Design a protein around this ligand. Structure first.
Ligand SMILES: [Mg+2]
Ligand SMILES: [Zn+2]
Ligand SMILES: [Zn+2]
Lengths: 50, 50, 49, 79, 1335
């Protein structure tokens, strides 16, 4: 039920109920998608030489 | 319109709620002059500046 | 929801523990009115009688 | 009286016997038709008992006496 | 109707035939087309009876011409209804098969001297078994395989008895007579009573003569004729959709009835014996499946692919008939609503809405309609209730006056879960309350559902008035301070009403009456906070409870004059002459009913929130952004915090500092920075307010109402005002890492994204914990009411002797719990004195209320005998003089009020918030330390050579102030019986070593230790000088691991230097880690160090669980000299020696833990030997009972006291007195040899046998302590033990016992429905018992 720092950007850490299912129900972030294999993904801007 | 308890602010640490209330004071704070200038019915080019 | 003009003070114990207070103006302008649609039905059968 | 019964618990000394002394006395006022001893001031059957216990006119010992004076005369009527 | 008791036995086959009404044969249930039952079915009318009345099935007999005949064409009975729940059925079985509760719970394998897997070898017909050896080569209970069974036929054929099947167990039980078995067992028990032979064999002897006294027969363990459940409790009803639905039992019979028919059809055709034995499998699968589905293997399932509900799951667990339909229920005359607050009421009045209260009193409205005669009939009144005449609102107004009503909120936390008000009708749709009782429920006004109840009977209509009106309990039974404390907003405006400042105009004027003191405020001439002398008029009871007057002026403000009109003439002015925060108001409330009665306080509390809210609204209190100010001495200090964390960022990369010590240094500077930023913000909210008045500038208290919120502590505290200003301290990832960079900025200047993300862990770790704790705790509260259910105050004064002496708890720190506040509400155990000698204040028993706590307070008493609940010795209960003051009312408890629930409640409730050297004395004092053995050092000062010594800091009188424990081998610089200075470290030694210091004086020699034989010589590398270094037990060589290396302290001759004052020699028999520094021949003196030996809610869960720890610090069986055993064949042993008795004993000790005593040291019995935590049972076996409970009530009270929750100790005392409800007996003479029995019954029988009947023919006893999982289970009653846990093993062990029940417990008097023998009913139940004396 704890939030790992790989949840960052893929699964929101606030939107959850406070009943007995508190650690289970989770929603995905704004810009997340589903990759061709099934893993999660999140966009990032690529810095090139600053 | 609505009166509520002012002793819920520090022990929920919701200083966001006090932060919200001031903007709505300004939100009609632009709107009332527009209503002051529409029924009194001055001009177009006075309004487009404002 | 709606916008409303809001104050902040204790009143004569009507905001004692998190209990909020209205006027009649928010009911006269009906800004907090909802509709509901329920459903009713009836069935007709044949019994052994 | 109305909201308290605290001065009456001195008149017995027990909390739970204060239940049963009014439980007997109010029961005869319901089905028997007995008359009260304290004036009503527009109250129901249960609360008029505790005023008489506050004035001490109803006690656990004395309640049987008014039955015993009745029981010694009720069998006297038939035989 | 009325019955005395309840009784179990085993059911005879003939007793099953008696109750039944017909033999079911065919498995039909309803004829498919016309919904009528069929003959001999599961609903057969010839067996069970009718559905209608006087109406037959074939329609032959009508019009009551045929009354007294069964209708022979259809067989239906004629007589009156309500019989479909009363009759039972029976069925005959072809082959008698085995029950399932006596197989794999086994009570036959115990009884037939065989393991259960070998008696299973018969019930699947894989193995034969032998009944009796006619020819004596074979014996009883011989397992033979199938081919070996045929070799038995080839040997003899007829002269032996061997079958295979469930018939054989029937024949096996018929064979043995129990008398020549049990009499042989007692003949066998006495010859060898070794331990595994002891307890195992008597468990048979517990059951074997029990069958003789129960009179039953053990052949009835196997059923031949199975009963049938009545047809109502397995109903088959047409549904609202026109289909049917059956319970699960009414097809499982169609498994048994069908597989019965396949057997009786088979045996008259005589199939071979691989088909026939397979048939007797499935009945034993099916007579299983009637009794239990999910027990013996894969369960039998229906079409839904889910397990079928058995007969066992009717009784098992919280889904069963116990906790869902018997103890709790549904009830009529009920309702619910959302709750809301209406503060216009008085204290005892509560709201009740209109169109709820019309249905809730519908029988009352009909009766008063038929009494006035406005309603002609009953149906007309139901016709008129929709007309809504105005008199209906009057008759309802007539009937609701002074008719009380109950308020509820699920879940019930403690005794204040339900109260009783008088209703006041409003026109809405919501329940209004009074605002002061929200804290009693722990209900907040955010959408609960409070429920109502209406008492019907005349007694309960008094019982609401007599016990549970809101006025008649203001004392919460946890602790004798009122729960009617001003909660959350009332403390705000009342704090505004008393305030000191020079700002208000007209200050210093004089007001004559407090009446006209209000007059200056109300027209608006000066503010309520301005200092003007007022004439005050108070009254005291300084005469014999008689009022006198006094009148004077006092220098105060004009606000405090207005509050004087509310205190009702019975308390001085000093209670409201102050700042008046929540620390003051609650103890003002305690002062009133102390002095004035009860009738003032309910009025005095009522006049608070009237004048409380009305001035707060005239005040007005707000909150703004610039109101909560961000200081200036934070970010420059953060600019210093960036000027030190960038420093050791560079020193980390150099390679000088480590990682973990660097982790201690940033948390040294950032976590203390929560306190460095604390002094900037408290300085910028206390005295930034400057309102000058007839001068240059001035200082006063704050005008922000944020400090004035915080110092009240309603919401907000010293830490809660900090996170509105700066960083909120520290954060922790719940996986286990605490971050080096927590928050720096604040709630007004924003949070960064990563700082927001890490602060989520502070929520979701904690937010999931509240629910889990709540779940655990409600399980715990259920497991506390169970073990303590029996206690009622039966007698007043048992008159037993002395018990516990009381001591304060203030060791280790300041004054924590004063002695007066524990002994308050208790009584004197004896005639106790004053320090003026022989000045007794008590004839052996007085109530110690606060008036007598004055006499204790003026002297210097710190030690008093208290009559506990442990020494109370009345039969089946406790007495009033051993329990003392009922804290919930405020006097001695009346005889008949319940105890064990009111202690099990008030332990359960606060558990929700439960889960979240160099010795310096403070002041001077006399030094009084006793039970010591110390010697003067070569330095000259006090050396601690005994483990029992600990310090005590004493005042000028004799009372204790501080105390600290000191271990062995320690050094002081001071002395005892003397005077010391303040701010002083009186004790100084190295604690990291456990030194091997020496009371002995003389030379030390290298004897009894040889290098290369006993130990090795690893000399000191630097200076060169070392000693024969004593190495560990296995780390040395095994050739001299047998020799205990004994350094011998020798003399000028070189002989055995003994202990000073005794003849016993002094040589240390050392295990390893004993590095001696001094060489051979170096003389030691008094105190020379030879060597050095260097170095939550689950807590309250286990301590009433009585769970044993993992390393028990075990104690000594007996005193005297102690030594070491064998050469650790797995573990070492301890040959200890008593002083004169039997010295044989030795046992396994894990020597790898550091021992305390050595092979030549002396000890007194009952002292700590190994190290670690300690098990309670060994404290029971070694100490008495008083030292056990005084350890427990010290232990569990500290877990609450750390969280600041005050519980009186009398609650936790009675649950250990119901923890000891059993005993194991030592000797014999009248009873069993050793087995367990109830320790209440022992003191009966030794007051019978070892009283004047004989000298001694009874027995002596031990005491046992048993955890709460089974201490309820072994009880003289059984239904209460059947009520909650392990529901199979409670019935069956009692089922063959032939037990009975006297209905002693109160829980069993709930499920019968009579009065409880407590509360009111204790006046009733003493009448019915004495009619049973002559009756
Ligand atoms: Mg609530
Ligand atoms: Zn018929
Ligand atoms: Zn007692």
């Amino acid at each position: 039920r704890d939030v790992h720092p790989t949840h960052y950007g893929r699964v929101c850490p606030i939107e959850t109920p406070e009943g007995p299912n508190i650690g289970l129900i989770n929603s995905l972030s704004v810009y997340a998608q589903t990759n061709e294999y099934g893993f999660l993904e999140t966009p990032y801007r690529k810095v090139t030489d600053g | 319109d609505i009166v509520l308890n002012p002793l819920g602010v520090p022990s929920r640490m919701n200083i966001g709620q006090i932060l919200e209330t001031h903007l709505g004071m300004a939100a009609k704070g632009i709107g009332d002059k527009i209503n002051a200038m529409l029924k009194q019915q001055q001009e177009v080019a006075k309004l487009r500046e404002f | 929801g709606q916008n409303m003009r809001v104050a902040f003070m204790p009143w004569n114990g009507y905001n004692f523990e998190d209990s909020i207070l209205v006027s009649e103006r928010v009911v006269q302008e009906d800004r907090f009115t909802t509709i509901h649609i329920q459903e009713l039905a009836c069935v007709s059968r044949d019994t052994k009688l | 009286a109305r909201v308290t019964v605290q001065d009456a618990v001195e008149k017995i000394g027990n909390r739970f016997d204060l239940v049963l002394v009014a439980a007997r006395r109010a029961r005869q006022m319901q089905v028997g038709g007995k008359d009260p001893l304290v004036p009503e001031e527009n109250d129901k059957t249960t609360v008029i008992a505790l005023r008489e216990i506050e004035e001490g006119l109803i006690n656990n010992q004395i309640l049987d006496v008014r039955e015993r004076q009745e029981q010694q005369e009720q069998e006297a009527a038939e035989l | 109707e009325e019955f005395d008791a309840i009784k179990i036995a085993l059911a005879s086959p003939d007793m099953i035939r008696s109750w039944s009404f017909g033999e079911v044969k065919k498995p039909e249930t309803i004829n498919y087309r016309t919904f009528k039952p069929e003959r001999d079915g599961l609903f057969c009318a010839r067996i069970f009876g009718p559905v209608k009345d006087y109406e037959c099935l074939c329609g032959k007999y009508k019009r009551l011409k045929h009354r007294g005949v069964i209708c022979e064409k259809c067989g239906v009975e004629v007589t009156q209804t309500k019989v479909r729940r009363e009759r039972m059925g029976h069925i005959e079985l072809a082959s008698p098969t085995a029950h399932i509760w006596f197989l794999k719970s086994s009570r036959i394998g115990l009884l037939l001297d065989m393991p259960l897997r070998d008696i299973e070898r018969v019930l699947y017909f894989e193995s034969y078994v032998v009944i009796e050896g006619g020819m004596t080569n074979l014996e009883r209970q011989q397992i033979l395989t199938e081919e070996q069974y045929l070799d038995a036929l080839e040997e003899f054929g007829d002269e032996f008895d061997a079958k295979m099947g469930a018939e054989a167990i029937q024949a096996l039980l018929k064979s043995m007579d129990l008398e020549q078995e049990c009499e042989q067992l007692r003949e066998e028990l006495n010859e060898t009573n070794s331990e595994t032979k002891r307890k195992k064999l008597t468990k048979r002897i517990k059951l074997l003569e029990a069958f003789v006294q129960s009179g039953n027969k053990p052949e009835w363990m196997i059923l031949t004729v199975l009963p049938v459940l009545p047809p109502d409790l397995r109903p088959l009803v047409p549904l609202d959709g026109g289909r049917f639905a059956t319970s699960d039992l009414n097809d499982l019979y169609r498994r048994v009835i069908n597989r019965n028919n396949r057997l009786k059809r088979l045996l008259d055709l005589a199939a071979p014996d691989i088909i026939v034995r397979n048939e007797k499998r499935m009945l034993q699968e099916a007579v299983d499946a009637l009794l239990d589905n999910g027990r013996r293997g894969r369960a039998i399932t229906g079409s839904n692919k889910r397990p079928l509900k058995s007969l066992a799951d009717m009784i098992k667990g919280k889904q069963g008939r116990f906790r869902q339909n018997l103890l709790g229920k549904r009830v009529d005359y009920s309702g619910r609503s959302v709750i809301t607050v209406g503060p216009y009421l008085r204290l005892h009045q509560c709201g009740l809405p209109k169109k709820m209260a019309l249905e809730l009193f519908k029988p009352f409205i009909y009766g008063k309609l038929e009494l006035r005669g406005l309603a002609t009939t009953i149906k007309a009144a139901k016709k008129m209730v929709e007309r809504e005449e105005a008199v209906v609102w009057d008759i309802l107004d007539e009937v609701i006056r002074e008719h009380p009503v109950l308020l509820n909120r699920a879940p019930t936390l403690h005794r204040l879960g339900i109260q009783a008000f008088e209703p006041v009708l409003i026109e809405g749709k919501a329940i209004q309350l009074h605002p002061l009782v929200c804290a009693a429920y722990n209900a907040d006004f955010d959408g609960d559902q409070m429920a109502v109840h209406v008492p019907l009977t005349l007694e309960a209509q008094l019982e609401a008035r007599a016990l549970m009106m809101s006025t008649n309990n203001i004392l919460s039974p946890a602790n004798g301070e009122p729960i009617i404390v001003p909660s959350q907003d009332v403390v705000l405006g009342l704090y505004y009403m008393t305030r000191d400042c020079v700002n208000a105009k007209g200050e210093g004027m004089v007001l004559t009456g407090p009446k006209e003191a209000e007059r200056l405020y109300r027209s608006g001439l000066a503010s309520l906070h301005a200092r003007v002398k007022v004439r005050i008029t108070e009254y005291e009871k300084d005469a014999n409870g008689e009022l006198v007057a006094k009148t004077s002026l006092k220098d105060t403000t004009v606000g405090r004059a207005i509050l004087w009109m509310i205190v009702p003439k019975g308390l001085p002015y000093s209670i409201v002459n102050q700042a008046l925060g929540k620390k003051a108001i609650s103890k003002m409330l305690n002062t009133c009913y102390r002095i004035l009665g009860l009738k003032p306080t309910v009025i005095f509390a009522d006049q608070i929130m009237y004048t409380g809210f009305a001035y707060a609204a005239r005040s007005g209190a707000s909150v703004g952004i610039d109101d909560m100010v961000i200081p200036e001495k934070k970010h420059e200090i953060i600019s210093e915090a960036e000027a030190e964390v960038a420093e050791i960022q560079e020193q980390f990369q150099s390679g000088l500092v480590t990682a973990g010590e660097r982790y201690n240094k940033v948390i040294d500077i950032w976590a203390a920075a929560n306190d460095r930023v604390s002094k900037a913000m408290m300085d910028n909210l206390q005295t930034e307010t400057v309102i000058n008045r007839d001068g240059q500038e001035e200082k006063q208290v704050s005008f922000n109402s944020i400090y004035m919120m915080a110092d009240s502590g309603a919401r907000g505290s010293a830490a809660q005002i900090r996170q509105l200003a700066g960083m909120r301290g520290l954060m922790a990832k719940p996986d286990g890492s605490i971050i080096e960079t927590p928050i720096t900025a604040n709630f007004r200047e924003g949070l960064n994204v990563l700082q927001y993300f890490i602060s989520t862990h502070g929520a979701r770790k904690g937010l999931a914990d509240t629910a889990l704790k709540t779940a655990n705790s409600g399980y715990l509260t259920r497991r506390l009411v169970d073990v303590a259910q029996d206690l009622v105050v039966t007698e007043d004064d048992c008159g037993t002797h002395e018990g516990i002496m009381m001591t304060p708890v203030i060791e280790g720190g300041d004054v924590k719990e004063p002695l007066r506040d524990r002994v308050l509400g208790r009584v004197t155990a004896e005639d106790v004195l004053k320090p003026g000698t022989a000045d007794i204040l008590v004839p052996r028993n007085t109530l110690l209320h606060e008036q007598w706590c004055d006499l204790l307070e003026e002297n210097s008493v710190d030690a008093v005998k208290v009559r506990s609940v442990v020494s109370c010795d009345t039969d089946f209960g406790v007495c009033a003089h051993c329990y003392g003051r009922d804290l919930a009312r405020g006097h001695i408890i009346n005889k008949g009020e319940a105890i064990g629930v009111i202690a099990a409640q008030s332990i359960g409730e606060p558990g929700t918030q439960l889960t979240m050297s160099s010795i310096q004395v403070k002041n001077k004092g006399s030094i009084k330390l006793s039970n010591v053995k110390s010697v003067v050092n070569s330095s000259g000062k006090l050396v601690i050579t005994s483990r029992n010594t600990e310090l005590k800091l004493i005042d000028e009188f004799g009372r204790t102030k501080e105390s600290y424990k000191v271990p062995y081998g320690a050094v002081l610089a001071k002395g005892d019986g003397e005077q010391v200075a303040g701010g002083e470290t009186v004790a100084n030694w190295d604690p990291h070593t456990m030194p091997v210091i020496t009371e002995v004086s003389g030379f030390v020699r290298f004897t009894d230790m040889i290098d290369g034989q006993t130990i090795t010589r690893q000399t000191d590398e630097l200076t060169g000088l070392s000693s024969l270094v004593v190495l560990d037990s296995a780390e040395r060589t095994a050739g001299g691991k047998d020799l205990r290396p004994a350094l011998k302290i020798v003399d000028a001759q070189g002989n055995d230097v003994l202990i000073p004052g005794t003849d016993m020699p002094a040589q240390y028999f050392l295990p390893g880690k004993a590095i001696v520094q001094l060489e051979d021949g170096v003389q030691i003196s008094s105190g020379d160090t030879l060597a050095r030996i260097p170095q939550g809610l689950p807590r309250v869960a286990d301590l009433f669980e009585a769970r044993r720890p993992k390393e028990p610090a075990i104690l000594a069986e007996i005193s005297g000299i102690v030594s070491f055993g064998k050469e650790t064949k797995g573990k070492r042993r301890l040959v200890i020696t008593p002083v004169d008795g039997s010295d044989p004993y030795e046992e396994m000790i894990p020597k790898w833990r550091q021992l305390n005593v050595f092979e030549g040291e002396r000890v007194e019995r009952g002292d700590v030997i190994s190290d670690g935590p300690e098990a309670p049972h060994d404290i029971l076996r070694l100490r008495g009972v008083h030292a056990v409970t005084r350890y427990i009530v010290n232990e569990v009270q500290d877990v609450y006291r750390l969280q600041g929750v005050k519980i009186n100790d009398k609650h936790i005392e009675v649950i250990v007195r119901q923890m000891l409800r059993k005993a194991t007996i030592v000797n014999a003479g009248s009873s069993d040899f050793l087995e367990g029995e109830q320790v209440e019954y022992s003191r009966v029988k030794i007051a019978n046998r070892e009283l004047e009947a004989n000298g001694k023919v009874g027995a002596t006893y031990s005491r046992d302590l048993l955890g709460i999982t089974k201490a309820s289970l072994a009880t003289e009653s059984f239904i209460s033990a059947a009520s909650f846990q392990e529901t199979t093993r409670v019935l069956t062990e009692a089922a063959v016992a032939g037990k009975r029940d006297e209905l002693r417990g109160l829980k069993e008097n709930v499920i019968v429905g009579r009065l409880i023998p407590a509360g009111t009913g204790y006046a009733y139940h003493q009448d019915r018992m004495r009619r049973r004396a002559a009756g």
